[PDB]
């Protein structure tokens with residue numbers, strides 16, 4: 307099972323920079339969403355959930371096929387709330403119908419990270435929409451009520467190592483949980499990409515509590531929260547060292563996140579030797595827009 311990247315016919319960097327820009331301008335415009343967080347965080351989560359269905363063993367799932375557009379995956383209980391991201395992207399897809407679904411979903415995540423002042427994420431085009439029967443079954447995305455050993459094992463299926471796992475989890479600086487989506491009660495929320503996930507883990511005074519959906523989560527007096535899988539990163543000694551590294555080196559976190567996130571978004575894709583190089587999109591700010 308091979309998924310070969312195929313450039314949308316006649317398209318080049320500039321074409322995709324126009325899609326980036328349309329996302330980025332809508333992100334700026336539609337600022338009321340989720341008590342003024344805006345859509346950045348949910349777009350990052352979308353890009354991650356369309357990619358995170360991948361299985362290295364048989365190359366099923368992953369971003370390539372754009373299968374989140376199909377009912378089985380759109381209605382996965384793990385994907386509750388991501389409909390908001392899909393709806394945000396709908397006008398963009400209508401404006402630029404030449405782009406594939408998987409390309410759009412993943413570029414939405416890239417755009418959101420960069421526009422939220424995160425690292426540059428190189429991004430490759432050529433994902434090709436696949437039929438409805440290629441949609442992966444529900445249940446391939448991770449549980450939050452688990453420990454470090456569960457997280458480590460789970461991410462082996464995505465070919466991620468300890469450093470890659472700890473780096474990716476830093477996206478949990480963004481946004482918040484919503485009881486109605488996931489059974490977790492959200493805490494202080496932000497829409498700027500920083501290493502604050504690691505700083506909060508190490509510096510806050512955490513208390514284990516049971517929320518109104520009966521689930522355990524870690525809460526701080528300052529109003530922040532951590533999932534049990536987040537907190538696991540300071541329970542396990544291997545994860546803890548990495549957490550400390552990123553809490554103490556913003557640039558290293560940025561560089562490692564960028565690599566991991568691009569890898570996550572490209573898992574399962576075979577890029578021809580003469581495929582275009584990855585694109586690095588300019589932010590609205592870099593363009594003076």
Ligand code: HEM
Nearest residue numbers: 347348350351354448449450474477481482483484487488
């Ligand atoms: C063990 C792995 C992970 C678990 C169990 C997990 C679990 C969760 C849960 C339960 C939520 C709350 C959803 C809601 O209530 O709306 C959430 C939100 C979020 N997740 Fe994760 N996640 C994990 C990994 C990741 C990764 C790898 C990324 C991306 C790199 C990511 C990005 C986000 C974002 C940005 C949000 C905020 C969404 C919003 O504000 O709407 N997560 N996650």
Ligand SMILES: NC(=O)CCn1cnc2ccccc21
Nearest residue numbers: 478481482493506530531532
């Ligand atoms: N320290 C925080 O409250 C950052 C927000 N946060 C912590 N864990 C999270 C998991 C998902 C979304 C946001 C999360």
